[PDB]
A paper describes a structure:
Interestingly, Connolly and colleagues found that archaeal B‐family DNA polymerases have evolved a so called “read ahead” mechanism to sense uracil in the template strand, stalling DNA polymerase promoted DNA synthesis of nascent DNA before the deaminated nucleobase reaches the polymerase active site. Here we report on three new crystal structures of the archaeal B‐family DNA polymerase from Thermococcus kodakarensis (KOD) DNA polymerase in complex with primer and template strands that have extended single stranded DNA template 5’‐overhangs. These overhangs contain either the canonical nucleobases as well as uracil or hypoxanthine, respectively, and provide unprecedented structural insights into their recognition by archaeal B‐family DNA polymerases. The template overhang binds into a positively charged crevice between the N‐terminal and the exonuclease domain of the DNA polymerase.
[4f] To study this in our context we performed analogous crystallization experiments with a hypoxanthine‐containing 21 nt template. The experiments resulted in a binary complex with the p/t complex bound by the enzyme in an open state, characterized by an open finger domain and no substrate triphosphate bound. All single stranded nucleotides could be modelled, however, the single stranded nucleotides C+2, A+3 and A+4 show weaker electron density and hence more flexibility compared to the rest of the template and compared to the same positions in KOD‐U. These nucleotides may adopt different alternate conformations. The first single stranded nucleotide T+1 does not stack on the p/t duplex but is rotated to the side and the nucleobase is twisted by nearly 90° compared to the p/t duplex end. Again the backbone amide nitrogen atoms of Tyr37 and Ile114 interact with the exocyclic O6 and the ring N3 of hypoxanthine, respectively while a water molecule, that is bridged by hydrogen bonds to Glu111, Tyr37 and Arg119 interacts with the 1‐NH group. The B‐factors of hypoxanthine are lower compared to the neighboring nucleotides which speaks for a stabilization in the binding pocket. Superimposition of guanine on hypoxanthine reveals a clash of 2‐NH2 with the main chain oxygen of Glu111 (nearest distance around 2.2 Å) or the side chain of Ile114 (nearest distance around 2.7 Å) explaining guanine exclusion. The only significant difference is a water molecule which participates in hydrogen bonds to 3‐NH of uracil and 1‐NH of hypoxanthine. In KOD‐H, the water molecule is displaced by 0.9 Å to accommodate the bigger nucleobase.
Author numbering: 1 to 759
The structure:
DNA sequence: TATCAACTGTGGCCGTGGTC
DNA sequence: GACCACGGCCAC
């Protein structure tokens, strides 16, 4: 199984390293024969002799063109001839590529920004994470001595904890009376012990939670201060800390540093991504948090260190358990994209598509378009019309069906062959024509992207079939994750077409997809209304809710099935309308906000405050309770009594502050905010102190008693102390609970004053 | 100098704090 | 007091 590739330099020449795990053994294979290259399109082939002679310099070394070769490729399906320029060392490419492009006989260069070790994986046909090899994993976490206004890592590491299949231990340099704590004499001895643990255990995967941005940088600074070679790499190298945009990421050579935080962030939507929140949401058990201040107090006084050590043990334990839960899936995604787990687990959606496409482009001799320059990028910022959203007939309805398309946008791309290489391609014998926007697509040959998307969807169906039939539980599970990875990829193509930074950006493709989507969903709505007499209550993009007002449940179902038979005989190709489910009652509040209940009692909620992180739990819980009264018990008066009771509890300071926390994400640098709401006001105050705020940080705050600007009396919940603080009960009534439930009960005539407790 | 210069789409409702 | 831009994060 291939884990990763990189290169090193030996007598000036690049040596590719392929890090493998075959049959329980780590291996390094070396390749010295692979040459970096990129392509040049020339105005005339005789200019190659001038281009051959262009030179550059690299730390006092002269950079030359090693050799050239004229080659035939396809560019958006059409034949083209380019010169493949070869070089001795990958760092020659950035030293010389601009000078070659600037040459007047060079129209443009292509494929000049592909990291060499990834170029190697593609051109060699090599695929990481193939096979059933079992990887050895090890989670770790640290606890540190924090004081507020200090430089990063001015304080020592206090404990290092780790966990694997054998359990969890804690190394520390004070005496703690717990069986899983190993005691050494100093911080230095502790770090060296941990390094020895790693080297002896020899894990393939080091699992952290936010180790990209805290743990490794901390260890590095302490190792600098204490004179420690922190040699975690399997080749003896130290961890490699690199900047990727506004974030950091950390490699450990020969291993996979699997930082769960970016993975969980892509995978699950939670209000906060504390380790405690994540563990509870995935596994369903609490995890107690110990705060930095208590940790420091415990260390400075020697008191209650057992609680700190257990917290530290638990960080490592739950980090290992989460790593076991999330890694196999990220592994199948890496295999599908064809790049390393380290990269793929940190990568954005658009980047995964592009890496997949670059590899398939190589296999098909398709020259890759370049990323846009600053001018082109600014041109691409124009937008287009998206999905159809019908204004709901608002209120409570009974005996509802939801019908929606199977993978609407991918079905469209495939059925109508929507691709930049088919877009208005001249001279064909068959075209499909996108409604409203008018773009024609050639049907005579499969477009590059439709062809790949089609192969993907077909593979996913074969996999689902083999899963059902298989008898091997290991294979079944690998198949499950691969089928899940294909769905993710296949559903990413439409947004990639509209992605300004994409190489295969195609605005005409994207707006053709959405125009076809609008035509299909609105055509289908009109058919079920006109030909079967349904009322369409509400519809968003690819599906709709409908019933027959005065009508039995089995009547609505049967007639929905008849309409489906009728409609799918009219739909072309892969377009297919499906029966998603039957809901006994539904409550439609606005566009994109509604809730339904099924026959078994299960409520499903969309768009309402209940699902959002920027609404306090007390508001969410109460709206949830109002909805159940309506949907389940059809009991409006009980809904009012619930609100009245909740608002009275709040005015009596009987609601625990833990239900008053509001979570809002910082999304940019604090200086760039033009308007400052409460979460930014808090963020700015924390930055004022010793606290780094980066995009993606969730500010979790509570509003304290007062009047005027919310932001002047908001504090991080971390710091809430009921002996020093009084929460703003009128705010949680007037700004949180009542607005959330008024928007629902507005439909039955109740105004805010019918919902408040009376003094 | 040892690596991609950066984090997919549009449609929609809402709270805050500012202006007029 | 009426209005609105900014920014949050949802649905698909
Ligand atoms: Br499915
Ligand atoms: Br409560």
């Amino acid at each position: 199984m291939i884990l990763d590739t990189d290169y090193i330099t030996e007598d000036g020449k690049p040596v590719i390293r392929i890090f493998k795990k075959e049959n329980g053994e780590f291996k390094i294979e070396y390749d010295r024969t692979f040459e970096p290259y990129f392509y040049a399109l020339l105005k005339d082939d005789s200019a190659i002799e001038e281009v051959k002679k262009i030179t550059a310099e690299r730390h006092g070394t002269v950079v030359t063109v090693k050799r050239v070769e004229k080659v035939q490729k396809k560019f958006l399906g059409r034949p083209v001839e380019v010169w493949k320029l070869y070089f001795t060392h990958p760092q020659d490419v950035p030293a010389i590529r601009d000078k070659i492009r600037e040459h007047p006989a060079v129209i443009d260069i292509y494929e000049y920004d592909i990291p060499f070790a990834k170029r190697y994986l593609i051109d060699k046909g090599l695929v990481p994470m193939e096979g059933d090899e079992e990887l050895k994993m090890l989670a770790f976490a640290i606890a540190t001595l924090y004081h507020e206004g200090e430089e990063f890592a001015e304080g020592p590491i206090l404990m290092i904890s780790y966990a694997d299949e054998e359990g969890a231990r804690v190394i520390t340099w004070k005496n703690v009376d717990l069986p899983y704590v190993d005691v050494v004499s100093t911080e230095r001895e502790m770090i060296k012990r941990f390094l020895r643990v790693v080297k002896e255990k020899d894990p393939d995967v080091l699992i952290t939670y936010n180790g990209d941005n805290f743990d490794f940088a901390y260890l590095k600074k302490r190792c600098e201060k204490l004179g420690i070679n922190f040699a975690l790499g399997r080749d003896g190298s130290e961890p490699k800390i690199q900047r990727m945009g506004d974030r950091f990421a950390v490699e450990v050579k020969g291993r996979i540093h699997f930082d769960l935080y970016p993975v969980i962030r892509r995978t699950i939507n939670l209000p906060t991504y504390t380790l405690e929140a994540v563990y509870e949401a995935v596994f369903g058990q609490p995890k107690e948090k110990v705060y930095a201040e208590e940790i420091t107090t415990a260390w400075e006084t020697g008191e209650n260190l057992e609680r700190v050590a257990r917290y530290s043990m638990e960080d490592a334990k739950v980090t290992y358990e989460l790593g076991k839960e999330f890694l196999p899936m990220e592994a199948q995604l890496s295999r599908l994209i064809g790049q390393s787990l380290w990269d793929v687990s940190r990568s954005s959606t658009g980047n995964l598509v592009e890496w997949f496409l670059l590899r398939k482009a190589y296999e098909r001799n398709e020259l890759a378009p370049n990323k846009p320059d600053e001018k082109e990028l600014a041109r691409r910022r124009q937008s287009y019309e998206g999905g159809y959203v019908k204004e709901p007939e608002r209120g409570l309805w009974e005996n509802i069906v939801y019908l929606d398309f199977r993978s609407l946008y991918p079905s469209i791309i495939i059925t109508h062959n929507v691709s930049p290489d088919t877009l208005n391609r001249e001279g064909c014998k068959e075209y499909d024509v996108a409604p409203q926007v008018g773009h024609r697509f050639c049907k005579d040959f499969p477009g590059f992207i439709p062809s790949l998307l089609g192969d993907l969807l077909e593979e996913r169906q074969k996999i689902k079939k083999k899963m059902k039939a298989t008898i091997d539980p290991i294979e079944r599970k690998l198949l499950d994750y691969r089928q899940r990875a294909i769905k993710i990829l296949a559903n990413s193509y439409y947004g990639y077409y509209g992605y300004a930074r994409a190489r295969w950006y195609c605005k005409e493709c994207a707006e053709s997809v959405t125009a076809w989507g609008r035509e299909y969903i609105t055509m289908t709505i009109k058919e079920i209304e006109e030909k079967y007499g349904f009322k369409v209550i509400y519809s968003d993009t690819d599906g709709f809710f409908a019933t027959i007002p005065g009508a039995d449940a089995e009547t609505v179902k049967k007639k929905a099935m008849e309409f489906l038979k009728y409609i799918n005989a009219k739909l072309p190709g892969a377009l297919e309308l499906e029966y998603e489910g039957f809901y006994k009652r539904g409550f439609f509040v606005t566009k994109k906000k509604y809730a339904v209940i099924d026959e078994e009692g299960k409520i499903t909620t969309r768009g309402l405050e209940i699902v959002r992180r920027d609404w306090s739990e007390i508001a969410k819980e109460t709206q949830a309770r109002v909805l159940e009264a309506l949907l389940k018990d059809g009991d409006v008066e009980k809904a009012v009594r619930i609100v009245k009771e909740v608002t009275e509890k709040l005015s009596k300071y009987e609601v625990p502050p833990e239900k008053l926390v509001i979570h809002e994400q910082i999304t940019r640098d604090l200086k760039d905010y033009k308007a400052t709401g409460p979460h930014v006001a808090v963020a700015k105050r924390l930055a004022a102190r010793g606290v780094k705020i980066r995009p993606g940080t969730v500010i979790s705050y509570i509003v304290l008693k007062g009047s005027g600007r919310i932001g002047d009396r908001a504090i991080p919940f971390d710091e809430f102390d009921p002996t020093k603080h009084k929460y703003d009960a009128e705010y949680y009534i007037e700004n949180q609970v009542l607005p959330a439930v008024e928007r629902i009960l507005r439909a039955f005539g109740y105004r805010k004053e019918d919902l408040r407790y009376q003094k």
